[PDB]
Amino acid sequence: STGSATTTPIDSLDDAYITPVQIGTPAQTLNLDFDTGSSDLWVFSSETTASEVDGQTIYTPSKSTTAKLLSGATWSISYGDGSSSSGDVYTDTVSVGGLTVTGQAVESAKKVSSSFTEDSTIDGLLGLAFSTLNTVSPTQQKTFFDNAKASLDSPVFTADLGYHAPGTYNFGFIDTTAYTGSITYTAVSTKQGFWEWTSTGYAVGSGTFKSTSIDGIADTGTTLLYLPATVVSAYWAQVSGAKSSSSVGGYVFPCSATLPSFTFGVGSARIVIPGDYIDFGPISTGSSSCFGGIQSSAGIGINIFGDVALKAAFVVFNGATTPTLGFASK
């Protein structure tokens, strides 16, 4: 089997992407944030504290003839941005882009933090990291990918995120029309439960490539590119008037600037992030200070190849017995 679903930016900045997901019988379609940096499929629901729901579509398990309480199971998750959610667990039928999993754990939110309430466009998360990170207790549950994998034509999924445009998540096949040149594959460590890999270096604009190992994670659920402070400083040094602002929470730059590209290495291959991908617009409405899309990972404890980086590539998440990542230009 295969699946193919369009993923759509939630706003004009590509802060996140939402993908429609069919849950239950009859189908309830929710728009979920596919997150290769976590491993819980959780939804706004009929159980979510009413004051914490503001415009989201909810899953109502009592209206699904295939929903079953997973008795005694609870979940609770904290993300890198300090957001959180928790609740109980149903099993139900879940379909993505025509690919159906029966008996998928659908984690129903009783509680969500303010950042989830305030975002009406995201109805929950669909985790695509390794199932070792799943938070369900006392019986850990599998991700949608892990449950689908045996049925897929190939044990893979791909992320093809758009810049200020829709893109695609495919399951079980690699669309050879969706990228240019060849796919470069690189090793993955699953030790921390992530799609963790080592970039071979970087370049800023038309500058020479710096060969250096940068361990980080391929994370579709993180907006920005978080890299070591040395690398980030070298990038923003090429932008007149850019500076790190402790008040704002990172590097800002004059909205009048033209940003240089940023290149990262994948083995001997190179992915180029155009300068426009690094602009996240005014820090507050009407400001001439703009927020940068490359920020320091110092104090996060891991480098993160978030959407800024991944949207510049066609990305293969190879879930074979020895997982690997692939990157192609597009």
| Tokens coding 168 | 């695609």
Domains of the chain: 5-174 (2.40.70.10), 175-330 (2.40.70.10)
- Strand, coil or helix: 271: strand
Q: Which of 14, 33, 35, 123 is catalytic?
A: 35
59-87 per-residue burial string, b: 16 or more CB within 10 A, e: under 16: bebeebebbeebeebebebebbeeeebbb
Resolution in angstroms comes to 0.9
Q: Which of 39, 199, 296, 297 is catalytic?
A: 199
288-315 per-residue burial string, b: 16 or more CB within 10 A, e: under 16: ebbbbbbbbbeeeeebbbbbbbbbbbbb
- Reply yes or no on whether 211 is catalytic: no
Q: What's at 248, amino acid-wise?
A: V
**Number of continuous H segments (helices) and E segments (strands) in the chain:** 4, 24
Q: How far apart are CA 313 and CA 329, in angstroms?
A: 5
235 Cβ contact partners less than 8 Å away, ≥ 6 residues apart: 204, 260, 262, 294
The sheet carrying 250-254 orders its strands as 243-245, 250-254, 289-292, 279-282
- Reply yes or no on whether 46 is catalytic: no
Cβ neighbourhood burial of 204 (10 Å; 0-12, 13-18, 19+): buried
Helix (H) or strand (E) holding 158: strand 156-160
The answer to whether residues 259 and 253 touch, using CB atoms and an 8 Å cutoff, is yes
Q: What's at 151, amino acid-wise?
A: S
Q: Cα angle at 19 between 13 and 22, to 5 degrees?
A: 155
Alpha-carbon dihedral 130, 131, 133, 137, rounded to 10 degrees: 180
Residue 180 DSSP label: S
